[PDB]
Design a protein around this ligand. Structure first.
Ligand SMILES: O=C(Nc1ccncn1)c1oc2cnccc2c1Nc1ccc2c(O)cccc2c1
Length: 262
C-alpha cells in the first residue's frame, strides 16, 4: 500500500526545468515519468517539511484532471514521481510556442481545469499556485493540474489582491484559487499574459494590490461567448467574497459548452 521507491529503481534522464522546491527531470520508472528532486546534498528541515507536505497532499488525489502521483523516493535524493505528459504546460503552449487553439478547444481546457479544482476543493485542498505553468496538457487533449509543493488542507500575475497585500496570517482560500483560475481564463481567451503593456513587475504588484489595476477584459477574442466573459469577471472580482466557488463555476462552463458548437 505504501508508495516509497527503493534506491536504483528510478532512472533520471533529461533536465526539463524547475518546480516548487526543486528541479524537474524526465525519468524511467515502469515507463516514462516526471521526477522532481529537492536536493543536491543533505536536506534542510525546510526541504523535509516541503517534501512531506506535497507527498501527503498528492496521495489524497485520484482524478483524471490531476497529475497522477505515482510514488516518492528519499534514499538517494528527496524525489516525487508522477506520470509523464509529452506536450507541455498551457503556459508553454500559449506564450512560448504560441499554439493557436480553437474556442471549442479553449473552453474544453477551462472545463477540465475547473473539473480538477472542484475535486481538490471538495477534498479541502487549496493549490495556492494555480497558473498556466502548472496546467499540463497531456497528449494534447487532457488537462492535468500539477505541482502541489505550495498546497494545503514569485509568480504574481495569478495572485489575488488579498494575496498581493500580505494582510493577516492567511490570505489563501478557495476564492484566491478561483482568482488564479480567472487569470487562466484570461490567458485562454486572450492568448496573452495580463498587463503586457506595463514593463514594471513592481508597479504591477503595487497596483493590483491597491486595486488600481485589473485585467483588461476587452482583449477577449470576438468569438469567445459572452457568458465566458461574464464568468471571467466573477472570478476576477477584487473582493474575495464576491467570487463563485468551483461547483458553481463548473456548472457555468458546462452550460455554455453545450449550447456552443451550433
Ligand atoms: O516542468 C515541466 N515542464 C517545463 C518546465 C519549464 N519549461 C518548460 N517545460 C514539466 O514537464 C512535465 C511533463 N510531465 C509531467 C510533469 C511535468 C512538469 N512539471 C512538474 C511540476 C511539478 C512536479 C511536482 O511538484 C512533483 C513531481 C513532478 C512534477 C513535474
Amino acid at each position: 500500500d505504501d508508495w516509497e521507491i527503493p534506491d536504483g529503481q528510478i532512472t533520471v534522464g533529461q533536465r526539463i526545468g524547475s518546480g516548487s522546491f526543486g528541479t524537474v527531470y524526465k525519468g524511467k520508472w515502469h515507463g516514462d515519468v516526471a521526477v522532481k528532486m529537492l536536493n543536491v546534498t543533505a536536506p534542510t528541515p525546510q526541504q523535509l517539511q516541503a517534501f512531506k507536505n506535497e507527498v501527503g497532499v498528492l496521495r489524497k488525489t485520484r482524478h483524471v484532471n490531476i497529475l497522477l502521483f505515482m510514488g516518492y523516493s528519499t534514499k538517494p535524493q528527496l524525489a516525487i514521481v508522477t506520470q509523464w505528459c509529452e506536450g507541455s504546460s498551457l503556459y508553454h503552449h500559449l506564450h512560448i510556442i504560441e499554439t493557436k487553439f480553437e474556442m471549442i478547444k479553449l473552453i474544453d481546457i477551462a472545463r477540465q481545469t475547473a473539473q480538477g479544482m472542484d475535486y481538490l476543493h471538495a477534498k479541502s485542498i487549496i493549490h495556492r499556485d494555480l497558473k498556466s505553468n502548472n496546467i499540463f496538457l497531456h497528449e494534447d487533449l487532457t488537462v492535468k493540474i500539477g505541482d502541489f509543493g505550495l498546497a494545503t488542507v514569485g509568480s504574481i500575475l495569478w495572485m489575488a489582491p488579498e494575496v498581493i497585500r500580505m494582510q493577516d496570517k492567511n490570505p489563501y482560500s478557495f476564492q484566491s484559487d478561483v482568482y488564479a483560475f480567472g487569470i487562466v481564463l484570461y490567458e485562454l481567451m486572450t492568448g496573452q499574459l495580463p498587463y503586457s503593456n506595463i514593463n514594471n513587475r513592481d508597479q504591477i504588484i503595487f497596483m493590483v494590490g491597491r486595486g488600481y489595476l485589473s485585467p483588461d477584459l476587452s482583449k477577449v477574442r470576438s468569438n469567445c461567448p459572452k457568458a465566458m466573459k461574464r464568468l471571467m469577471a466573477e472570478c476576477l472580482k477584487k473582493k474575495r467574497d464576491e467570487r463563485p466557488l468551483f461547483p458553481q463555476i463548473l456548472a457555468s462552463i458546462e452550460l455554455l459548452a453545450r449550447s456552443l458548437p451550433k
